[PDB]
Design a protein around this nucleic acid. Structure first.
Ligand SMILES: [Mg+2]
Length: 68
RNA sequence: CGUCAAAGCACUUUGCAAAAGCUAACGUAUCUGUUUCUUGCCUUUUACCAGAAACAGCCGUUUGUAAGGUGUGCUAAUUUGACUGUAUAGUUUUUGUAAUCU
């Protein structure tokens, strides 16, 4: 991460660990290899929260751009 | 080669689907890109250097199947599959040592 990390979430159905930070990018860490595999890009500013949907394969992030 | 069965057959165009299960060339051939690391050259970025891991793309290949095209046929041609496939009265089976009664 380039800047402060502001949100983590360990998926209970995948061996993943999603993280977000004030550096505007959301990362998907593969916990089987401890390496970043996915990048989620659209965010105009820092990201302050990260949550994972309990059932679907979808995640929600909300940040300073007044948009979730 | 033979008998039986069903399928028109040979070449070809396109669509659809699939392609390691028991460690192994779908391709005896061989490119590119992204991410995360470690490097090289480095004044800063692109373009770069060369090794790894995880992913993708492109050039191709094979098979199945569906609908067509061309040339020849259905007054036959070819293909695919299956088959416990052959003679023979002269001792080892199928051209009778049978009848007779008990
Ligand atoms: Mg500048």
């Amino acid at each position: 991460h380039i800047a402060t990390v502001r949100g983590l979430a360990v998926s209970p159905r995948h061996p993943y660990l999603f993280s977000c930070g004030e550096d505007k990018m959301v990362k998907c860490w593969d916990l089987e290899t401890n390496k970043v595999i996915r990048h989620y890009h659209g965010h105009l500013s820092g990201v302050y929260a990260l949550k994972l949907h309990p059932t679907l394969d979808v995640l929600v992030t909300a940040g300073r751009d007044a948009v979730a």
